[PDB]
TrEMBL record, chains B, C:
The chain crosses the membrane at residues 25-49, 61-80, 92-114. One of its GO terms (biological process) is potassium ion import across plasma membrane. It is found in: Membrane. InterPro entries: Ig_E-set, IRK_C, K_chnl_dom, K_chnl_inward-rec_Kir, K_chnl_inward-rec_Kir_cyto. This is Inward rectifier potassium channel. Residues 123-264 form the Inward rectifier potassium channel C-terminal domain. It comes from Burkholderia pseudomallei. The lineage of its organism: Bacteria, Pseudomonadati, Pseudomonadota, Betaproteobacteria, Burkholderiales.
Length: 266, 264, 264, 266
């Protein structure tokens, strides 16, 4: 196809910062660096004014000159129009360089660290269904590859949480070969099923919860991406079916996602 | 917890799509693209410079072309120094252009490695599959082999069948061998079509009738990067040749005759 | 195929050992180390400069200190230009110093990210394990929980036993549950000591006699980087408390009382 | 613990170059870049001499000056002592910059690409053994973590190749919890074993070969590193045993590898 309150576990402001460094959006990433870039120069520019006769030909003479020189020395561009006169000028200048490169290095580190973030995301049907299939009462939930990055050859595990014990639900099929389109995961509610004999009311009574999870590899980076979804009992629709998301035209069949989490009683 | 075919209807943000091409594109095209992006980036600042008169000291050649060739100076952090921001505004732009430039380099480099990271070892499959009498029973075979310079040995495989039923039921075809130790040469994967086989009793015509499809998939690790590379192939029913055999490539092996067969 | 305790007696090349510390070391120490490596690197070239007289034009302060502060100029590709290689030799050094410098930056950056790459999510185990009557039978339990900011949910675990036999036989203790869906809080891993259990009929004294040891291991993926992080823990027999229970941390949970127990 | 001739499969000189870029040793890596660095300037320096009056203050006047300016413009250091006079001077200069950065970028890419190479290596005993253990005739081979980087919690698969069919040999233990020391892998040669009833001579007759393979993760990078070893039939020693590689002193037991692949008949 084309197109709770933790208490006692030590947290560090450091790690939290990194977390946002990755969760944040691109535009916000740089703007943040900018606001961090300016701040970094302001700091050295001031550090320069401390000693008089800092940079030769410091223009515009004053703080603004010491600033626009900072940006020069920090990025290793070094025009040379300015030049450390006094020893102290150098001492600062030199220390500012070590900072600058480390500056670049860390940013670049983050920049790639962000690229590394897995790409292929997997959408689940906001609603799950229980419907008579091939004679017996089965349960189904469908998911499908959602980003440009493909996951084919994906395997899945389906669970149940209720009053709090955790039950495994045997899937009719555990792995899916050509996931590149969509997947309709389903679990038969026969004698062995932990769900056997459980009316919609019987679920609520025990605060039931359905947990699915699909793992698979991004064929493009080898990164093994996993994704997870949870349904509340009031999110399972009884005796419903998934609106078919796959038309056909000119002998060519396509698949419309526009109506992905939509259902219709049987 | 806190301390104390084709698809339609997809998202598809322009950003992500751009990155995708940044990786799918070929090397030459990668850089040329940057070039065309590099020029564009300077043109933009050069213009931004002309806005204020007396921008760069000794701006030669005096005019737009000078402001351009200065841009390339300030953006790459090379900074000859022949030019120099005179007016405050000159600096304001210059300084903002630097932050951009480095970020420029950083992103490119990020992409550059992001491309290196792409898994390397590719696995070719025989454009044609076969069903032939082997050791008494009617078995099915398809062969694949490591294709790039990067090796995959110790590779495991899963073989599937897709047909229409009463929906496209996906069946697991039991392979005679699931894993292959020394894959460094080639692999002849095969599935016996006995009583248990979902393919048992199915004439070539019987396949078409249900739009049958064979899906194989081989996973294994690139011993050189540890990257676990997977590859996949699909055969249509008219791509299975009946009562055929794979021409023995082979001490010399002629991978040219890889997907070639001969009736028994 | 071509087209057409402590250990002794180990290899341990100095290079690899250096890299190991490059990653084990703490951030502050990382840079300071580079600094001390940065200075050293210039001192070396500055001296290399003094060898030939009339090295850098306008070398200020005239003397070694000038040749130093020029080094830092030429090594970081900042190149103010106040100084300039006069003599040919000046250039020869200067040019060779540049190749070094960039390689300098490149390697550092390489390390810098190589450190970022280090898996983040860490998993703490209860310093003490317990054996207690649960649901009728004598079972054994140990609990662990996600410890860093980075989450591991959907984690699976393997539990082992090491004792001396007639060699240190390694036995697999069947866990009541092998995988845990929502690990985002905590996990209470437990193994029933019935007839099949290799621990069946073994008094606390019976353990020591054979130098018993409990080895657990939890694997799971950091949902944020896809990196599959594993963690491991070992208990000595005197670290198992008999007929005890884990103090319920818990809506608030006090992870401070994590490895605390109370007899039943 | 502390301390064949392929014919028809397309190869590209490109890919082959990268392969060496990673297989090569560090010193050789850079020297190679150097020799590649010089070459790169020589090329532009010449490209400069084509047009007269290339770089202002081109010292030493001549080719050597155009060279030492190249190194200036290529590394984005740009002293500024030299400066493109003629338009052509710039045209070259500008094109040389785009190259230079791409230069750095690719090198850095390689530099990290090398760091990424898995680290933890796993040594196998050059010799394997078949010895009476606990009554029955079993076969053993030992391996142990070899680099500074640890693999614990390692699993292994053992195979047999003979006249050419490939047999799986059931290991007494498939996975090893605390691999941080050493591992003695062993396969009982009872009725079910494909090796049952096979004298050392019986092996050779069919060109037997033993293939082991251990996979496990580097707890430090999450990289799942695998390693592989092969024994010829004349590399299996019969009725031998592995010299014990684990002494004890002061109540503290250590492990000497100095005698790792050494054996002694029973
Ligand atoms: K300069
Ligand atoms: K400069
Ligand atoms: Mg520079
Ligand atoms: Mg001036
Ligand atoms: Mg002039
Ligand atoms: Mg002066
Ligand atoms: Mg001069």
């Amino acid at each position: 196809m084309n197109v709770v309150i933790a208490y006692g576990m030590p947290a560090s402001v450091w790690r939290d910062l990194y977390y946002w460094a990755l969760k944040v959006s691109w535009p916000v990433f740089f703007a943040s660096l900018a606001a961090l870039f300016v701040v970094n120069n302001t700091l050295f520019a001031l550090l320069y004014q401390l000693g008089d006769a800092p940079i030769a030909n410091q223009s515009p003479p004053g703080f603004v000159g010491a600033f626009f020189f900072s940006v020069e020395t920090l990025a290793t561009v070094g025009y040379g129009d300015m030049h450390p006169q006094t020893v102290y000028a150098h001492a600062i200048a030199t220390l500012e360089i070590f900072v600058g490169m480390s500056g670049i290095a860390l940013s670049t580190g983050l920049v790639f660290a962000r690229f590394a973030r897995p790409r292929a995301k997997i959408m689940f049907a906001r609603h799950a269904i229980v419907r008579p299939f091939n004679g017996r009462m089965t349960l189904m939930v469908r998911a499908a590859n959602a980003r440009q990055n493909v996951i084919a050859e994906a395997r899945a595990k389906m669970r149940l949480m209720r009053r709090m014990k955790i039950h495994d639900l045997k899937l009719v099929r555990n792995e899916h070969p050509i996931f590149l389109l969509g997947w309709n995961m389903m679990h038969v509610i026969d004698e062995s099923s932990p769900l056997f004999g459980e009316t919609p009311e019987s679920l609520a009574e025990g605060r039931a919860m359905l947990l699915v999870m699909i793992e698979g590899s991004d064929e493009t980076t080898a990164q093994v991406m996993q994704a997870r979804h949870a349904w509340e009992h009031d999110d399972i629709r009884w005796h419903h079916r998934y609106v078919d998301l796959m038309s056909d035209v000119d002998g060519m069949t396509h698949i419309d996602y526009t109506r992905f989490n939509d259902t219709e009683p049987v």
